[PDB]
Amino acid sequence: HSDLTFCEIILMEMESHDAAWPFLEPVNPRLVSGYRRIIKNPMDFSTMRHRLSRGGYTSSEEFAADALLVFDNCQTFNEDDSEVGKAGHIMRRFFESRWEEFY
Ligand SMILES: CCc1c(-c2csc(CCCN)n2)[nH]c(C)c1C(C)=O
């Protein structure tokens, strides 16, 4: 629980980031046609927050994998020059920068 505090900090910094707006909650299939058809494993920051809050991450590596899944999904579905596409690249580098401050 307490040993993952730094992942909690990274998640908060991600949630508070200017480019985080597409990723705060799960993508709504009634708003994005066929999204979950194309993306088998959706992921978002609120889902990660709830998993951290219940102690559902057995390692920091599992948390990092969910973070990358947010950005891999975004790059799979969104054009690179779209608003969400741009935000995903910005956020991926932000996450990578924070991760390499510990690893
Ligand atoms: C463009 C739709 C989209 C949003 C989006 C657009 S507007 C918004 C804010 C909702 C309220 N916080 N999210 N996000 C993601 C990851 C999307 C896709 C297709 O991948």
Provide the domain count of the chain: 1
Contact (Cβ atoms closer than 8 angstroms) between residue 59 and residue 53: no
Query: Could you tell me the resolution of this structure in angstroms?
Result: 1.6
The technique is X-ray
Does the beta carbon of 32 sit less than 6 angstroms from any atom of ligand 1?
A: yes
3-class secondary structure, 75 = helix
Instruction: Give how far Cα 56 sits from Cα of 27, 42, 97, Å.
Output: 22, 17, 24
What's the first-to-final CA gap in the chain, in angstroms?
A: 19
Domain interval for residue 60: 2-102
CA of 25 from ligand 1 middle (Å) equals 8
- Residue in the block written with tokens 């956020």: 91
CATH code of the domain covering residue 54 = 1.20.920.10
Does the beta carbon of 25 sit less than 6 angstroms from any atom of ligand 1?
A: yes
* CA 53 – CA 18 distance, rounded (Å): 23
Q: Whose CA is nearest to atom 9 of ligand 1?
A: 22
Q: Whose CA is nearest to atom 15 of ligand 1?
A: 22
Residues 6+ apart with CB under 8 A from 6: 60, 102
Does the beta carbon of 74 sit less than 6 angstroms from any atom of ligand 1?
A: yes
